[PDB]
Design a binder for this molecule. Structure first.
Ligand SMILES: Cn1c(=O)n(C2CCN(CCCn3nc(-c4ccc(Cl)c(CNC(=O)c5ccccc5)c4)ccc3=O)CC2)c2cc(Cl)ccc21
Length: 220
């Protein structure tokens, strides 16, 4: 029996909202956000991890294009292959494509594996968010209603299931019966509800939220 509502922020597993600026690095912020929660679950410490590390180092071999887009799954594979990712403090975000500056001396997390969830299955996504932690997802954010969102449960009839923006599902619930996914964005804390958007849940894979979910794990 899953909880009716989940909010990983209340459990100390979510870092402060980040601001990607003019660099299309949402995939990198989605990936580090998911791994940040697993690091807290494993070690008890909450540490912001380096999105810039992914932008600069998880590149053409991983199909990623830095400030021009990428995949959360191949970001996880880079962290696995590299045997680490630096802290955000040591490798801070510059919103630019740079040469790789990874230094194992400042490693703050590792990744053992990642799991992809089946396309469009919001029931499986709910289970993963409840039982595993925050889940990286793509959404279709190419709608003014999306970036103009201020509060409430977001529903856009013109939304598609084809994703183009990486975000992090940190919980779920309902607002007076309107079910939602609790989504951490990387557009700063003045977007939406202090940086978050509550997106329609169980409305036919609204905006592609459950099209391509994935989450990392840190295993002993
Ligand atoms: C080593 N390696 C891989 O493992 N892949 C993977 C990448 C993930 N796909 C899974 C496809 C699932 N899928 N995901 C998205 C998707 C999910 C999240 C996000 Cl936010 C985005 C947005 N990202 C982009 O639109 C993007 C832009 C520029 C460069 C890369 C991605 C897309 C869209 C369609 C689709 O079938 C399998 C091959 C590789 C792909 C390439 Cl092109 C080159 C090397 C790769």
């Amino acid at each position: 029996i899953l909880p009716d509502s989940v909010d990983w922020r209340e459990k100390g597993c979510v870092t402060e909202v980040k601001y990607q600026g003019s660099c299309g690095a949402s995939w990198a912020f989605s990936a580090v956000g998911a791994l940040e929660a697993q690091l807290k679950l494993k070690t008890g410490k909450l540490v912001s991890l380096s999105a810039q590390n992914l932008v600069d180092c998880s590149t053409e071999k991983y199909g990623n294009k830095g400030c021009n887009g990428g995949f959360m799954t191949t970001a996880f594979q880079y962290i696995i292959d590299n045997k680490g990712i630096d802290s955000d403090a040591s490798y801070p975000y510059k919103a630019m494509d740079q040469k790789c500056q990874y230094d194992s001396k400042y490693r703050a997390a590792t990744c053992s594996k990642y799991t992809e969830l089946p396309y469009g299955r919001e029931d499986v996504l709910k289970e993963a968010v409840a039982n595993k932690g925050p889940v990286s997802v793509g959404v279709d954010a190419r709608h003014p209603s999306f970036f103009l969102y201020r509060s409430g449960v977001y529903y856009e009839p013109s939304c598609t299931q084809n994703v183009n923006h990486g975000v992090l599902v940190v919980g779920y619930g309902d607002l007076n019966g309107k079910e939602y996914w609790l989504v951490k964005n990387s557009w700063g804390h003045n977007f939406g509800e202090e940086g978050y958007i509550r997106m329609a849940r169980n409305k036919g894979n609204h905006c592609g939220i459950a099209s391509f979910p994935s989450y990392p794990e840190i295993l002993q």
